[PDB]
């Protein structure tokens, strides 16, 4: 069960992973067009266009970066 544990976990790495990225690329452009509008369109928010970049995209990212990290982690690494 070790193999299949294995190659499975990693491919579903792959597959959660887009799966994920088509969901949180969607989200993202979602909230992020909205968030990045009002902020890009108030000269003080600029520094928030970044920082909204990176946060919206990785808090969204942190859910597959969670459970592949921690796979990984363990995986990878503690195996």
């Not at 369109?41 to 859910?63: C, K, N």
């Amino acid at each position: 069960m070790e193999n299949l544990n294995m190659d499975l976990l990693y491919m579903a790495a792959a597959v959660m992973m887009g799966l994920a990225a088509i969901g949180a690329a969607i989200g993202i452009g979602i909230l992020g067009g909205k968030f990045l509008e009002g902020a890009a369109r108030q000269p003080d928010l600029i520094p928030l266009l970044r920082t909204q970049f990176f946060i919206v995209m990785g808090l969204v990212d942190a859910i597959p970066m969670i459970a592949v990290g921690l796979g990984l982690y363990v995986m990878f690494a503690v195996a």
